[PDB]
Amino acid sequence: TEKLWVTVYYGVPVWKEATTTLFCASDAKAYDTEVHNVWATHACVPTDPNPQEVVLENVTEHFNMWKNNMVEQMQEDIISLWDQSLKPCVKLTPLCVTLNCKDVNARGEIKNCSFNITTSIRDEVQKEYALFYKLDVVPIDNNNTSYRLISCDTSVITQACPKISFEPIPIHYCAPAGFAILKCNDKTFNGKGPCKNVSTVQCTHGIRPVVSTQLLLNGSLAEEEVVIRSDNFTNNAKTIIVQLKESVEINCTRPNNNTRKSIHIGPGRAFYTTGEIIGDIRQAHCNISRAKWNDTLKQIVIKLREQFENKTIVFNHSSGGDPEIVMHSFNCGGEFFYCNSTQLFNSTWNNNTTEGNTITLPCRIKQIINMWQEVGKAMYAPPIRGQIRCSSNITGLLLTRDGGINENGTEIFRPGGGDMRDNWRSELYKYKVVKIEPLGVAPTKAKRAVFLGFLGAAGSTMGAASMTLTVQARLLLSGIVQQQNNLLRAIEAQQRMLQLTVWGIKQLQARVLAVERYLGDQQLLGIWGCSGKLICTTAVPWNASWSNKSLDRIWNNMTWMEWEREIDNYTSEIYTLIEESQNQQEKNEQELLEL
C-alpha cells in the first residue's frame, strides 16, 4: 500500500531488442562426416536435438522484416568462411599470359588452348591441350587467336583446392546465453510489420548455404497458399521477393563423362582442366514440365490482383548486363551451372478480363567464378572425372518491379536478380533476437500445475507474472553454456585447424560476455546489497513523482513492456537514489561494527 517500499525483482520475463553475435548448431553435421572438407568450409558444434520450443500467444510484437541485423553477420561470416578456405589454396599467378586456341565442335563454344608457357623450372609446355568454354575467355585480337582470360587484370588467380568439397549443410543456428530468438507462429503474415501468434526459439531450422539468381534452389515451402513479401513504400523502385506454396524439383542434366588431367605447374601447383571426354557431349539442360509452371503463373496474378486494381502482367527478359544475374547460377555438385531462361518468358500473361508439356533449358556452366561485391579475387574450380544430374525443389522467386509508365496499365516483369543477402533474408523472415535484462523493480504490494511459457508471464497476467521467474532464466542466460550442456568438447574442439577459428574465438568471446553480465549483475546485486533473493524490499518509499496509478491496476493488466517504458524516464534515477540510501545504510552500521 502507501508504505510503497520499492522492491527489486530478479529474473523478470522481459526483453530488449539488441544485436549481439550469433551462434550456430550442427547436430546433423555431427551426425555424419565422410570427410571434413565441407566441415572445413562449414564448421559448427552440435546442439542436442529435440530442442525446447515454447509458444507465447498473448503478446504481439512488431516484426521488422528486411531490416534485421541478423542478416548482416551471417553474410559477412560466410565471406570470411570463404576467406579461410582460400588461405591455404594456391594462387594461379603466371596465368594471364597469352593463349593460342582453336575452337572444338562436338554446340560450338568449347575450345582447346595450347601455348608457349614457361610453367616450371624447366619443361616448356607447348602441347598443352587445355579445353575451355566461350564464357570463360575474353575474346581479344579477334582476327588473330588470342581469346583469353576474363578477369586476369585483377587478383583472380585464386582457385579451389581439389580435396575441398562444397556441398552445403543444413545448419541450425542458436544464440549465446542471455539472448532468445523470437518466432512468429502466424502464417506467412506480411512483408513488414507485427503479428499476433508468436513464440520463442532457441535454435532455428537448418539452412543450406545456397546462392542462386532469380531463383530459389533447395528452399523452404509455404504452408499457406502463395504469398508475397515487400516493403511497399518504394515499391515502384525496389526488387522484392516471392514465396511459393508448393515446389517443383528440376533434374538438370549431364554434359558427358570427363577427365581431370593434372598439369605440372610447380610446388603445390598442379591444377586441373579437362583433356579427355568419354564420347560425344550432349548439351546441358535443366528438365521440367511446363504445366506445373503453367499453374504457378496464374497463382502469381492472384497475388498481383491483390495488389493491382487491374494492371496488365507482362514478362520480358532482363537487360544484357550482369550475365550471372541474368542467367541462373546452379552451384550444385560444386559446379557452377548457368542456363539460358529466354525460353521461359516468351509468354507474357493474358489479362483474362498440350503444346509443349515439358521444357529443357539451354545451359552453359562456367569454369571461372568471380567475387561479386568487388573487383578482384575470382574463384576457379577444377573439372570432375564425371557428369552430374542434380535436382532441387524450387520454392520461391525474385523479381523486379520495372517501374515506369508506357501504355497506362501495362507493366512488365523482367526477372529480378540480387545479392547473397536477400537469399538469406528470406528464411530468416520469422526470426528476431532480443536480449534479457533479468532485473526489475516495482513498489510493494499491500501484504508483505504445468510448465509455463518463457514469456507467457509477460504474455498474460503481468500482475500474476510474480511466479516462475527462475525457470525463465534457467534456459536463457543461466546455464551459461546451454549449447551441448556439460559444454561438449566435440568435433569442433576436436580436429580444428590452427585453433584460430571464426567460431571458437567468437565462442571464447561468447562465454566471457555471458558471465560478466551475470557476475556484473551480481556485482550490482552486491552493490544493491542483496544476492540470492529474487526480491529485496528496499528502504525508500515510492515517491509518486514517477507515476500516479493505483496499486491493484498495476497487478491488473499492465504489460511489462508497457511498464518498462513508462519508467524509462527514471532509469538511472530510480537506480541512484535507493543505492545511495542503501549506501546510507552502509554508513550506518559500519561505524557501529567498529566497537
Ligand X SMILES: *[C@@H]1O[C@H](CO)[C@@H](O[C@@H]2O[C@H](CO)[C@@H](O)[C@H](O)[C@H]2NC(C)=O)[C@H](O)[C@H]1NC(C)=O
Ligand Y SMILES: *[C@@H]1O[C@H](CO)[C@@H](O)[C@H](O)[C@H]1NC(C)=O
Ligand Z SMILES: *[C@@H]1O[C@H](CO)[C@@H](O[C@@H]2O[C@H](CO)[C@@H](O[C@@H]3O[C@H](CO)[C@@H](O)[C@H](O)[C@@H]3O)[C@H](O)[C@H]2NC(C)=O)[C@H](O)[C@H]1NC(C)=O
* Residues of this chain, 442-501, that bind its own copies according to CB under 8 A: 447-448, 463-464, 466-471, 474-481, 486-496, 498-501
Q: Among 316, 343, 523, 543, which residue interacts with ligand Z (rule: CB under 6 A)?
A: 316
Is there binding between residue 112 and ligand X (CB under 6 A)? yes
Distance CA 302, CA 282 (A): 39
Is there binding between residue 306 and ligand Y (CB under 6 A)? yes
Q: Which one of the spans 242-250, 289-297, 555-563, 580-588 is the region binding its own copies (CB under 8 A)?
A: 580-588
Q: Among 71, 86, 89, 104, which residue interacts with ligand X (rule: CB under 6 A)?
A: 104
Q: Which one of the spans 240-248, 295-303, 311-319, 579-587 is the region binding its own copies (CB under 8 A)?
A: 579-587
Closer to its own copies by Cβ: residue 61 or 521: 521
Minimum gap (Å) between residue 57 Cβ and ligand Y: 3
- Count of residues near ligand X by CB under 6 A: 18
Contacts with ligand X, 251-280, as mask; x by CB under 6 A: x-----------------------------
Distance CA 52, CA 265 (A): 54
Minimum gap (Å) between residue 71 Cβ and its own copies: 12
Which parts of 346-385 interact with ligand Y (CB under 6 A)?
Answer: 351
Is there binding between residue 514 and its own copies (CB under 8 A)? yes
Contacts with ligand Z, 226-265, as mask; x by CB under 6 A: -------------------------x-x------------
Q: Among 33, 543, 557, 581, which residue interacts with ligand X (rule: CB under 6 A)?
A: 543
Contact partner, 314, from ligand Z, ligand Y, ligand X, none, Cβ < 5-8 Å per class: ligand Z
Minimum gap (Å) between residue 318 Cβ and ligand Z: 8
Q: Which one of the spans 118-126, 224-232, 412-420, 542-550 is the region binding its own copies (CB under 8 A)?
A: 118-126
**CA distances, 421 to each of 60, 163, 201, 234, 432 (Å):** 27, 28, 22, 19, 16
Cα Rg of the chain, angstroms: 31
Give the residue nearest to ligand Y (CB): 57
Residues 6+ apart with CB under 8 A from 376: 154, 155, 156
Which parts of 271-300 interact with ligand Z (CB under 6 A)?
Answer: 287
Q: Among 196, 533, 549, 553, which residue interacts with its own copies (rule: CB under 8 A)?
A: 533
Minimum gap (Å) between residue 215 Cβ and ligand X: 16
Distance CA 420, CA 41 (A): 17
Closest residue by Cα to residue 7 from 554, 558, 592: 554
Q: Which one of the spans 197-205, 313-321, 445-453, 522-530 is the region binding ligand Z (CB under 6 A)?
A: 313-321
Closer to ligand X by Cβ: residue 30 or 198: 198
Residues 6+ apart with CB under 8 A from 125: 117, 119, 263, 264
Closest residue by Cα to residue 11 from 422, 470, 442: 470
Contact partner, 479, from its own copies, ligand Y, ligand X, none, Cβ < 5-8 Å per class: its own copies
Is there binding between residue 58 and ligand Y (CB under 6 A)? yes
Judged by DSSP in three states, 535 sits in strand
DSSP letters, 446-476, are S-------SSHHHHS-SGGGGS-TTTTTTTT
CB of 265 within 8 A of CB of 117? no
Distance CA 105, CA 131 (A): 11
Minimum gap (Å) between residue 222 Cβ and its own copies: 30
- Phi, psi for residue 109 in degrees, rounded to 5: -110, -10
Minimum gap (Å) between residue 411 Cβ and ligand Y: 12
Half-sphere exposure of 128 (CA within 13 A, CB side): 24
Closer to ligand Y by Cβ: residue 310 or 572: 310
- Count of residues near ligand Y by CB under 6 A: 9
Closer to ligand Y by Cβ: residue 468 or 484: 468
At 416, list the grid cell: 529480378
Residues 6+ apart with CB under 8 A from 285: 252, 253, 339, 360, 361, 362, 363
Half-sphere exposure of 438 (CA within 13 A, CB side): 28
User: What are the beta bridge partners of residue 31?
Assistant: none
Contact partner, 306, from its own copies, ligand X, ligand Y, none, Cβ < 5-8 Å per class: ligand Y
Residues 6+ apart with CB under 8 A from 347: 297, 315
Burial level of 121, CB count in 10 A (0-12/13-18/19+)? exposed
At 573, list the grid cell: 534515477
Closer to ligand X by Cβ: residue 199 or 483: 199
Closer to ligand X by Cβ: residue 165 or 197: 197
430 C-beta neighbours (distance < 10 Å), count = 23
- Count of residues near ligand Z by CB under 6 A: 9
- Count of residues near its own copies by CB under 8 A: 104
DSSP letters, 143-194, are TSS----TTTTSS--BB--TT-------BEEE--TTEEEEE--SSS--SSEE
Contact partner, 112, from its own copies, ligand Y, ligand X, none, Cβ < 5-8 Å per class: ligand X
Is there binding between residue 517 and its own copies (CB under 8 A)? yes
Q: Among 57, 77, 324, 422, which residue interacts with ligand Y (rule: CB under 6 A)?
A: 57
Which parts of 555-574 interact with ligand Y (CB under 6 A)?
Answer: 556-557
Beta pairing class for 172-174 and 179-183: unpaired
Distance CA 327, CA 347 (A): 18
Closer to ligand X by Cβ: residue 38 or 110: 110
Contact partner, 186, from ligand X, ligand Z, its own copies, none, Cβ < 5-8 Å per class: ligand X
Which parts of 395-434 interact with ligand Z (CB under 6 A)?
Answer: 406, 412
CB of 168 within 8 A of CB of 212? no
Which parts of 119-178 interact with ligand X (CB under 6 A)?
Answer: 127, 129, 131
Give one word for 519, left, alpha or beta, with left for phi > 0 and alpha for psi -120 to 50.
alpha
- Phi, psi for residue 560 in degrees, rounded to 5: -55, -40
CB of 232 within 8 A of CB of 357? no
User: What residue ranges bind ligand Y (CB under 6 A)?
Assistant: 57-58, 196, 305-306, 310, 351, 556-557
- Chain residues binding ligand Z by CB under 6 A are 251, 253, 287, 314, 316, 319, 358, 406, 412
Sites of contact with ligand X (CB under 6 A)? 55, 104, 112, 114, 127, 129, 131, 185-187, 197, 199, 251, 287, 289, 391, 543, 545
